[PDB]
Design a protein around this ligand. Structure first.
Ligand SMILES: [Ca+2]
Ligand SMILES: [Ca+2]
Ligand SMILES: [Ca+2]
Ligand SMILES: [Ca+2]
Length: 316
């Protein structure tokens, strides 16, 4: 999914001095938001958890409850997201798209399609431990049809391991996709799901090329031509992630920031979930496509402390 994040372990880290630094920034009338945003933004997540622990043993206070009572809005929502242990952030985001009453499919899609099987295994485990219920049971209860089925397949976190290309198998899957969509009166979604959901990543990159070659269409155009609604978005997320997780996340960031507004929720989530994985690589793919740094888009799209914090996450 990887290569590099923007946030790194600060050197000569002292969670006791940091905890006092944060106590100071909140103690009394007012909040020193800048001292908060600068400290939390230059501490890796593991270090934020140590701070939180030091704070509680120093003052008998919950750091998270204090930040929430001192901060407000998006900047708040961003600090809260940043304090969330890495291990639980995606489970949280997933939990939260499944509740409140109405289901947020863009969040299921985004996360399930862009995380690896190894990340999904981890995610399934912590969601169960944290919410009791099974991620899988919760998706299915809130979704239906091929969209639900495609998510269930991905949730198995059982994609074939990369392994030297079987050209006969590449031609057969490309031909199968050709026959299931373009040559078919209607569509065979089941075939798309099986191939997208279980073939190895190196194998599907090859299938996508062979598919183009055979049909004169990119698989994304076919998806657009043959599917609609939630399934379409997902199939496109999966294909884009196969091709490049970074590129898909960069793209996700972009469309978050271009409307007559800003998707703060989305914006936070990708910047925070990927800061210690591949935000760096998302940076370069943002520039590469869209032509513009993420810094400026963000810089031009956001205000305040929020803006400062975001840019602090992003860099260069
Ligand atoms: Ca205060
Ligand atoms: Ca608040
Ligand atoms: Ca068709
Ligand atoms: Ca369409």
């Amino acid at each position: 999914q990887v290569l590099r994040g923007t946030v790194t372990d600060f050197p000569g880290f002292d969670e006791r001095a940091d905890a006092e630094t944060l106590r100071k920034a909140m103690k009394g009338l007012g909040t020193d938001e800048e001292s908060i945003l600068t400290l939390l933004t230059s501490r890796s997540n593991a270090q934020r958890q140590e701070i939180s622990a030091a704070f509680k043993t120093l003052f008998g206070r919950d750091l998270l409850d204090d930040l929430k009572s001192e901060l407000t809005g998006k900047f708040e929502k961003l600090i809260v997201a940043l304090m969330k242990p890495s291990r639980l952030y995606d489970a949280y985001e997933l939990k939260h798209a499944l509740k409140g009453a109405g289901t947020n499919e863009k969040v299921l899609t985004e996360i399930i399609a862009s995380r690896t099987p190894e990340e999904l295994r981890a995610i399934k485990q912590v969601y169960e431990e944290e919410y009791g219920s099974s991620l899988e049971d919760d998706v299915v209860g809130d979704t239906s049809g091929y969209y639900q089925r495609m998510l269930v397949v991905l949730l198995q976190a059982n994609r074939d391991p990369d392994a030297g290309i079987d050209e006969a198998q590449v031609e057969q899957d490309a031909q199968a996709l050709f026959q299931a969509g373009e040559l078919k009166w209607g569509t065979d979604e089941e075939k798309f799901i099986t191939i997208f959901g279980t073939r190895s990543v190196s194998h599907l990159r090859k299938v996508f090329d062979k598919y183009m070659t055979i049909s004169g269409f990119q698989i994304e155009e076919t998806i657009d031509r043959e599917t609609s609604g939630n399934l379409e978005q997902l199939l496109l997320a999966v294909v884009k992630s196969i091709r490049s997780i970074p590129a898909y996340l960069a793209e996700t960031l972009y469309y978050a920031m271009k409307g007559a507004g800003t998707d703060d929720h989305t914006l936070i989530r990708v910047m925070v979930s990927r800061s210690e994985i591949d935000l760096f690589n998302i940076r370069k793919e943002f520039r590469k496509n869209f032509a513009t740094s993420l810094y400026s888009m963000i810089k031009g799209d956001t205000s305040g402390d929020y803006k400062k914090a975001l840019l602090l996450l992003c860099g260069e």
